[PDB]
């Protein structure tokens, strides 16, 4: 077992608060950000030894990335944005930062309850997401 365990399973969104602005934020155009906010996906998570999977599922756009803690990685994000990921673990939180164009956000993905939270931040704008068992 792994504490990173605690996050593996299937999970669906069921509230998400300030999307929109953290999309603005971002620099995601208008016709993007009014189809991925509408969007309802299911985070897929999954451990498989030192590699950690997670996949997003919507009508929006399907997504899957894959990655070991504290090693950087190139992703194409939904919005078409290619950027240099890191993920680590900081005290049981995953923390995701995406940099590109000399810009940065960061991402953090927590259980809290029976939920999964998500926690998006750019510059002075965070969204929140939240997630349950699907
Ligand atoms: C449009 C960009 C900024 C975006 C889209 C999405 C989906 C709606 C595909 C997501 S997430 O996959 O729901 O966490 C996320 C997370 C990783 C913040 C970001």
């Given at each position: 077992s792994h504490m990173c365990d605690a996050f593996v399973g299937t999970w669906k969104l069921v509230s998400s608060e300030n999307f929109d602005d953290y999309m603005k934020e971002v620099?995601?155009?208008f016709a993007?950000?009014?189809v991925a906010g509408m969007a309802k996906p299911n985070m897929?998570?999954?451990v498989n030894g030192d590699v950690i999977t997670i996949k997003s599922e919507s009508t929006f756009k399907n997504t899957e990335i894959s990655f070991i803690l504290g090693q950087e990685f190139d992703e194409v994000?939904?919005?078409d944005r290619k950027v240099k990921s890191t993920i680590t673990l900081?005290?049981?939180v995953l923390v995701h930062v995406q940099?590109?164009?000399?810009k940065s956000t960061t991402i953090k993905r927590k259980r809290e309850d029976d939920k999964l939270v998500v926690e998006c931040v750019m510059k002075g704008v965070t969204s929140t997401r939240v997630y349950e068992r699907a």
């Amino acid at each position: 077992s792994h504490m990173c365990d605690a996050f593996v399973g299937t999970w669906k969104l069921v509230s998400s608060e300030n999307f929109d602005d953290y999309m603005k934020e971002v620099g995601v155009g208008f016709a993007t950000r009014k189809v991925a906010g509408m969007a309802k996906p299911n985070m897929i998570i999954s451990v498989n030894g030192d590699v950690i999977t997670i996949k997003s599922e919507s009508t929006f756009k399907n997504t899957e990335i894959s990655f070991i803690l504290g090693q950087e990685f190139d992703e194409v994000t939904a919005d078409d944005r290619k950027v240099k990921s890191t993920i680590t673990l900081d005290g049981g939180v995953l923390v995701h930062v995406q940099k590109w164009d000399g810009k940065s956000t960061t991402i953090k993905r927590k259980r809290e309850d029976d939920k999964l939270v998500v926690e998006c931040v750019m510059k002075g704008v965070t969204s929140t997401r939240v997630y349950e068992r699907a």
